[PDB]
Design a protein around this ligand. Sequence first.
Ligand SMILES: CCN1CCC[C@@H](Nc2ccc(-c3c(C)cc(C(F)(F)F)cc3O)nn2)C1
Ligand SMILES: Nc1ncnc2c1ncn2[C@@H]1O[C@H](COP(=O)(O)OP(=O)(O)O)[C@@H](O)[C@H]1O
Length: 488
Amino acid sequence: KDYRKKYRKYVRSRFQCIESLNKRYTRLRLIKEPIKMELLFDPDDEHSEPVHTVVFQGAAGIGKTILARKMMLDWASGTLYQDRFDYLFYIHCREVSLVTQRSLGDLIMSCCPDPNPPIHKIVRKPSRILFLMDGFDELQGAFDEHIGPLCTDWQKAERGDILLSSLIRKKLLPEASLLITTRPVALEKLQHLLDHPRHVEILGFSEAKRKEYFFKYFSDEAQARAAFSLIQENEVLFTMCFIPLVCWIVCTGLKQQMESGKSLAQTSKTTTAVYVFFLSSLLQGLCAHLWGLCSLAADGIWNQKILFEESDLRNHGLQKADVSAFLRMNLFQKEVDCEKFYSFIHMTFQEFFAAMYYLLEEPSRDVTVLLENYGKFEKGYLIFVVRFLFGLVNQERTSYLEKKLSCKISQQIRLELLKWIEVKAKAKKLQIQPSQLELFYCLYEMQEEDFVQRAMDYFPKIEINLSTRMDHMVSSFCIENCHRVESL
Ligand SMILES: CCN1CCC[C@@H](Nc2ccc(-c3c(C)cc(C(F)(F)F)cc3O)nn2)C1
Ligand SMILES: Nc1ncnc2c1ncn2[C@@H]1O[C@H](COP(=O)(O)OP(=O)(O)O)[C@@H](O)[C@H]1O
């Protein structure tokens, strides 16, 4: 009762996104499978029982965390679910252990400011609680669909997997609301737990909200208009900027280009090109501690560690001066509430350095065993690890950052990637790992026509489902380089 005031105060301070949230938060396009945030839990014209599970699916960098944090902030300010929820608990999935034994009470108390919250008072009205799980796909380790028995006592300590499974399956606090944000990759794993869910999709920035971000990022009208005009000209950057992460990456590297006397230009055509242009802007140590960065990222992906302690990065070679320089470069970030944890700015950046670990000029560097774990939850699906390998393998594409890569092993990896496409396109009997459209994103990163044309011949018939202008751009490129041997 009185604790709700103390709790909303704590939430309002923690969720001010000072890495302001209201200052740079740009409206995200959400569509049901357009939706008004307050009406998310309201039953449609047809049914009368309110919706308890709502799932937000979004691509990497689309803003699932920014949306979840903006919801925490809005609610704590009395502008969202004021009459609906007494408590909103923020479960940040990357910090959650699926093996450590904890009860639902222990988990709820973790979200509180004080060491002794009134837990029995809080769980008195379970329907007045909204558990908000940000990043389901970021649960480190294997998520088993066969685990049990399910739990019905909020005080019984259970293993993390049994605890979240019982919470998601609506066994623990059955009338409590749930908001799960996930990448569509994990939707396979999640759909089996879900109990009557409302599915919502985060489509990112509109063309209008793209311009808005550029004018919010740059506090000088001349600079904001120059950066937006650059994107309006580049078909790839204009198309890619629907992802708010691409908006930030592009704006940040364009800001560094404005500090120097360089005329605004970005001739990037692939996601690899964008990431290498961004990382090249930071090369003003990044080039000395490259092997350490890539070994940290490969270990974090293969042994499932999103958050690294000071001891972990010290083991990989990154000393106090190196972590303090990478943090300033906006490559690393301080995370896990006020605890001394570190992580790459985005999961895509960890996958970019994991992909680079396999190509570095001299974890297991065998690309065969990496491809064997592709599309599996227990390793993070390896989507950008494989995509960035296609891009970085490109020999008719170099930079100072790419010159430190072994062209001896990138030619062996290039041939192992081509055998992979051949296996995946031919045997279409598999139940999702690289879809045909996903293989097109991989070939788009490759960009070299000898490879793209050789690989496109392995596809017997083009069977794709386009949804975005990105899907059109990528698939259009692949089909252009898909000409029969006898053709014409
Ligand atoms: C499930 C795997 N796959 C199946 C085929 C369709 C594909 N759809 C997308 C959409 C956007 C992005 C994406 C990109 C192109 C760049 C960035 C980055 F710039 F931020 F890196 C982030 C992204 O999420 N990827 N795939 C997903
Ligand atoms: N609505 C938004 N407004 C402004 N910036 C955003 C927004 N959504 C995402 N971002 C940018 O994208 C970056 C990563 O987004 P995030 O929410 O972590 O993505 P996801 O959780 O889907 O992987 C943030 O650091 C931020 O700069």
